[PDB]
Amino acid sequence: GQIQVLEGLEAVRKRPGMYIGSTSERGLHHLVWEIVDNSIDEALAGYANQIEVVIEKDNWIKVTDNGRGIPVDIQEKMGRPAVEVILTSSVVNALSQDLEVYVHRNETIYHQAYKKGVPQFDLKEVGTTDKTGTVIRFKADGEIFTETTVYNYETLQQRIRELAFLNKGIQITLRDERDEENVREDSYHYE
Ligand SMILES: Cc1[nH]c(C(=O)Nc2nc3c(OCc4ccccc4)cc(C(=O)O)cc3s2)c(Cl)c1Cl
Ligand SMILES: [Cl-]
């Protein structure tokens, strides 16, 4: 089970272009689409209706949704929490130098961090909450994306606007916090 996980990460890092199209600027932006697509699926299942994408200092990406939260129940097949199985099978996690998740579920905040898809510690209870949803924060691996790891605000804006237009009823917000002195936000919500 666990051995099959490591080979999966190795495979994605060995031929990243086969999984995200390219290691150019295009492939870097794809990382955001892959995570946002998971939030959109949770909205289409009837659970979520708000997605926030933040470009943080040093081109971290934070994606937050108000869905049910990725499940944390032990996956009888792997003996690992479901969220760990799901994120260790993620292309984005494989192609990130660092990735962390916060799940709000069962009135609890759970946290796990990864490097190149490898968990750095067991899923941990870190707090309490009266909300549900998922926070993903990731830093693209510069060893993979050798051209640029800098996000283009207008590229992300055009695609987020498109996703809000195609998926009516979902509020999707993009915020650029890289320059703390000039913060830019665009928020889209069709019908
Ligand atoms: C930013 C973000 N959000 C999500 C996300 O919310 N995905 C979810 N998948 C799921 C989900 O997927 C299927 C599942 C997987 C393992 C164990 C039970 C169900 C189930 C349930 C549920 O049963 O309550 C809830 C969620 S929420 C993901 Cl994945 C990412 Cl990345
Ligand atoms: Cl759960």
GROMACS .gro file of C-alpha atoms and ligand atoms in nm:
model
  223
    1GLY     CA    1   0.000   0.000   0.000
    2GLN     CA    2   0.252   0.261   0.135
    3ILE     CA    3   0.535   0.133  -0.102
    4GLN     CA    4   0.291   0.186  -0.399
    5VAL     CA    5   0.245   0.551  -0.282
    6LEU     CA    6   0.624   0.630  -0.299
    7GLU     CA    7   0.659   0.480  -0.654
    8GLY     CA    8   0.356   0.699  -0.756
    9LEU     CA    9   0.530   1.018  -0.630
   10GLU     CA   10   0.862   0.911  -0.796
   11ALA     CA   11   0.670   0.854  -1.129
   12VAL     CA   12   0.512   1.204  -1.127
   13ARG     CA   13   0.845   1.378  -1.034
   14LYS     CA   14   1.031   1.176  -1.304
   15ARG     CA   15   0.799   1.282  -1.597
   16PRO     CA   16   0.595   1.577  -1.463
   17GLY     CA   17   0.503   1.692  -1.819
   18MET     CA   18   0.307   1.365  -1.873
   19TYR     CA   19   0.079   1.468  -1.575
   20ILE     CA   20   0.044   1.852  -1.600
   21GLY     CA   21   0.117   1.913  -1.975
   22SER     CA   22   0.449   2.099  -1.922
   23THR     CA   23   0.694   2.232  -1.657
   24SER     CA   24   0.660   2.582  -1.818
   25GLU     CA   25   0.446   2.871  -1.679
   26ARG     CA   26   0.142   2.676  -1.818
   27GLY     CA   27   0.215   2.371  -1.596
   28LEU     CA   28   0.274   2.592  -1.290
   29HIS     CA   29  -0.078   2.746  -1.327
   30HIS     CA   30  -0.225   2.391  -1.379
   31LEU     CA   31  -0.131   2.315  -1.011
   32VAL     CA   32  -0.393   2.577  -0.904
   33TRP     CA   33  -0.659   2.429  -1.146
   34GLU     CA   34  -0.607   2.078  -1.004
   35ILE     CA   35  -0.669   2.190  -0.642
   36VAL     CA   36  -0.958   2.426  -0.734
   37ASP     CA   37  -1.119   2.142  -0.940
   38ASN     CA   38  -1.144   1.933  -0.614
   39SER     CA   39  -1.328   2.224  -0.442
   40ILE     CA   40  -1.558   2.260  -0.748
   41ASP     CA   41  -1.642   1.884  -0.723
   42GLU     CA   42  -1.741   1.935  -0.353
   43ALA     CA   43  -1.971   2.225  -0.464
   44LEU     CA   44  -2.122   2.015  -0.748
   45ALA     CA   45  -2.187   1.732  -0.491
   46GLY     CA   46  -2.406   1.997  -0.312
   47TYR     CA   47  -2.177   2.084  -0.016
   48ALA     CA   48  -1.951   2.387  -0.091
   49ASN     CA   49  -2.036   2.729  -0.243
   50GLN     CA   50  -1.724   2.943  -0.166
   51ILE     CA   51  -1.364   2.896  -0.289
   52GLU     CA   52  -1.082   3.142  -0.212
   53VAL     CA   53  -0.746   3.130  -0.395
   54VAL     CA   54  -0.467   3.341  -0.239
   55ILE     CA   55  -0.124   3.409  -0.395
   56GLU     CA   56   0.089   3.445  -0.079
   57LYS     CA   57   0.439   3.586  -0.027
   58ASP     CA   58   0.707   3.382  -0.217
   59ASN     CA   59   0.437   3.239  -0.452
   60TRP     CA   60   0.274   3.005  -0.204
   61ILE     CA   61  -0.085   2.926  -0.310
   62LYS     CA   62  -0.363   2.886  -0.049
   63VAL     CA   63  -0.694   2.733  -0.160
   64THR     CA   64  -0.981   2.735   0.088
   65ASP     CA   65  -1.332   2.593   0.044
   66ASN     CA   66  -1.638   2.565   0.273
   67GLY     CA   67  -1.719   2.202   0.185
   68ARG     CA   68  -1.749   1.908   0.429
   69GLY     CA   69  -1.370   1.881   0.477
   70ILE     CA   70  -1.164   1.597   0.333
   71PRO     CA   71  -1.245   1.288   0.549
   72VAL     CA   72  -0.995   1.192   0.822
   73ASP     CA   73  -1.139   0.839   0.897
   74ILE     CA   74  -0.878   0.557   0.881
   75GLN     CA   75  -0.881   0.414   0.523
   76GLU     CA   76  -0.905   0.038   0.617
   77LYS     CA   77  -0.711  -0.043   0.290
   78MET     CA   78  -0.400   0.176   0.379
   79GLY     CA   79  -0.441   0.197   0.764
   80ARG     CA   80  -0.391   0.576   0.706
   81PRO     CA   81  -0.639   0.868   0.737
   82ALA     CA   82  -0.839   0.917   0.413
   83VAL     CA   83  -0.702   1.275   0.370
   84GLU     CA   84  -0.345   1.133   0.376
   85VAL     CA   85  -0.431   0.872   0.107
   86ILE     CA   86  -0.600   1.141  -0.111
   87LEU     CA   87  -0.318   1.399  -0.081
   88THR     CA   88  -0.032   1.139  -0.119
   89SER     CA   89  -0.202   1.044  -0.455
   90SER     CA   90  -0.207   1.418  -0.561
   91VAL     CA   91   0.008   1.539  -0.858
   92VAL     CA   92   0.014   1.885  -0.693
   93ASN     CA   93   0.156   1.735  -0.369
   94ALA     CA   94   0.421   1.535  -0.567
   95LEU     CA   95   0.528   1.853  -0.758
   96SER     CA   96   0.532   2.079  -0.446
   97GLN     CA   97   0.847   2.133  -0.235
   98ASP     CA   98   0.597   2.180   0.056
   99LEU     CA   99   0.221   2.133   0.096
  100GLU     CA  100   0.000   2.151   0.406
  101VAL     CA  101  -0.365   2.075   0.467
  102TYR     CA  102  -0.602   2.200   0.735
  103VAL     CA  103  -0.936   2.013   0.754
  104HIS     CA  104  -1.230   2.158   0.950
  105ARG     CA  105  -1.454   1.857   1.019
  106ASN     CA  106  -1.617   1.688   1.322
  107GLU     CA  107  -1.583   2.031   1.506
  108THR     CA  108  -1.204   1.969   1.488
  109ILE     CA  109  -0.911   2.123   1.294
  110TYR     CA  110  -0.673   1.856   1.157
  111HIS     CA  111  -0.329   1.940   1.010
  112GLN     CA  112  -0.074   1.749   0.799
  113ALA     CA  113   0.229   1.873   0.603
  114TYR     CA  114   0.414   1.707   0.314
  115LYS     CA  115   0.738   1.754   0.121
  116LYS     CA  116   0.737   1.627  -0.242
  117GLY     CA  117   0.420   1.432  -0.145
  118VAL     CA  118   0.580   1.261   0.160
  119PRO     CA  119   0.397   1.323   0.493
  120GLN     CA  120   0.628   1.495   0.749
  121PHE     CA  121   0.420   1.368   1.050
  122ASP     CA  122   0.092   1.185   1.120
  123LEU     CA  123  -0.234   1.381   1.075
  124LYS     CA  124  -0.274   1.585   1.399
  125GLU     CA  125  -0.572   1.743   1.581
  126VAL     CA  126  -0.456   2.110   1.629
  127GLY     CA  127  -0.780   2.290   1.731
  128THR     CA  128  -1.159   2.316   1.728
  129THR     CA  129  -1.407   2.479   1.491
  130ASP     CA  130  -1.781   2.524   1.425
  131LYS     CA  131  -1.715   2.541   1.043
  132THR     CA  132  -1.636   2.277   0.780
  133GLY     CA  133  -1.400   2.292   0.481
  134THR     CA  134  -1.050   2.235   0.356
  135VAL     CA  135  -0.743   2.461   0.335
  136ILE     CA  136  -0.453   2.359   0.106
  137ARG     CA  137  -0.131   2.568   0.098
  138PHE     CA  138   0.146   2.462  -0.144
  139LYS     CA  139   0.478   2.587  -0.280
  140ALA     CA  140   0.559   2.461  -0.636
  141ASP     CA  141   0.888   2.272  -0.653
  142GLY     CA  142   1.152   2.486  -0.832
  143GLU     CA  143   1.344   2.162  -0.913
  144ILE     CA  144   1.037   2.067  -1.135
  145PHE     CA  145   0.925   2.413  -1.259
  146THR     CA  146   1.268   2.533  -1.365
  147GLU     CA  147   1.144   2.822  -1.593
  148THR     CA  148   0.934   3.015  -1.336
  149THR     CA  149   0.754   2.957  -1.004
  150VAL     CA  150   0.594   3.309  -1.019
  151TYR     CA  151   0.215   3.312  -1.076
  152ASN     CA  152   0.056   3.551  -1.328
  153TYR     CA  153  -0.241   3.722  -1.151
  154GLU     CA  154  -0.424   3.787  -1.485
  155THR     CA  155  -0.382   3.420  -1.594
  156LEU     CA  156  -0.536   3.301  -1.263
  157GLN     CA  157  -0.805   3.574  -1.281
  158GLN     CA  158  -0.922   3.475  -1.636
  159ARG     CA  159  -0.949   3.105  -1.542
  160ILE     CA  160  -1.118   3.168  -1.202
  161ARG     CA  161  -1.375   3.398  -1.376
  162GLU     CA  162  -1.433   3.118  -1.634
  163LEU     CA  163  -1.481   2.853  -1.359
  164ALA     CA  164  -1.732   3.078  -1.171
  165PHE     CA  165  -1.918   3.140  -1.503
  166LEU     CA  166  -1.927   2.763  -1.589
  167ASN     CA  167  -2.016   2.655  -1.230
  168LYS     CA  168  -2.303   2.899  -1.150
  169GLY     CA  169  -2.374   2.953  -0.776
  170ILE     CA  170  -2.008   2.915  -0.659
  171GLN     CA  171  -1.838   3.230  -0.522
  172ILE     CA  172  -1.470   3.212  -0.626
  173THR     CA  173  -1.231   3.480  -0.494
  174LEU     CA  174  -0.872   3.541  -0.610
  175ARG     CA  175  -0.645   3.758  -0.389
  176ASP     CA  176  -0.279   3.859  -0.450
  177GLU     CA  177  -0.103   3.916  -0.111
  178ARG     CA  178   0.257   3.899  -0.250
  179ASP     CA  179   0.290   4.280  -0.209
  180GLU     CA  180   0.142   4.352   0.140
  181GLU     CA  181   0.132   4.728   0.043
  182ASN     CA  182  -0.097   4.673  -0.264
  183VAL     CA  183  -0.339   4.380  -0.223
  184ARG     CA  184  -0.560   4.303  -0.527
  185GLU     CA  185  -0.876   4.091  -0.512
  186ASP     CA  186  -1.137   3.979  -0.767
  187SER     CA  187  -1.448   3.786  -0.658
  188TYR     CA  188  -1.683   3.612  -0.906
  189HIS     CA  189  -2.034   3.480  -0.836
  190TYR     CA  190  -2.277   3.405  -1.124
  191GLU     CA  191  -2.656   3.365  -1.053
  192LIG     C1  192  -0.921   2.220  -0.158
  192LIG     C2  193  -0.984   2.085  -0.153
  192LIG     N1  194  -1.109   2.051  -0.114
  192LIG     C3  195  -1.133   1.918  -0.125
  192LIG     C4  196  -1.253   1.845  -0.088
  192LIG     O1  197  -1.326   1.905  -0.013
  192LIG     N2  198  -1.276   1.719  -0.123
  192LIG     C5  199  -1.361   1.643  -0.050
  192LIG     N3  200  -1.375   1.512  -0.083
  192LIG     C6  201  -1.463   1.448  -0.003
  192LIG     C7  202  -1.508   1.307  -0.003
  192LIG     O2  203  -1.451   1.223  -0.095
  192LIG     C8  204  -1.476   1.080  -0.094
  192LIG     C9  205  -1.427   1.003   0.030
  192LIG    C10  206  -1.292   0.970   0.043
  192LIG    C11  207  -1.247   0.899   0.156
  192LIG    C12  208  -1.336   0.860   0.256
  192LIG    C13  209  -1.472   0.891   0.243
  192LIG    C14  210  -1.517   0.961   0.131
  192LIG    C15  211  -1.601   1.269   0.091
  192LIG    C16  212  -1.656   1.358   0.183
  192LIG    C17  213  -1.753   1.304   0.284
  192LIG     O3  214  -1.793   1.178   0.275
  192LIG     O4  215  -1.789   1.369   0.382
  192LIG    C18  216  -1.615   1.491   0.187
  192LIG    C19  217  -1.521   1.537   0.097
  192LIG     S1  218  -1.461   1.694   0.082
  192LIG    C20  219  -1.012   1.857  -0.175
  192LIG    CL1  220  -0.967   1.685  -0.214
  192LIG    C21  221  -0.921   1.963  -0.196
  192LIG    CL2  222  -0.752   1.944  -0.254
  193CL      CL  223  -1.404   1.191   0.890
   0.00000   0.00000   0.00000
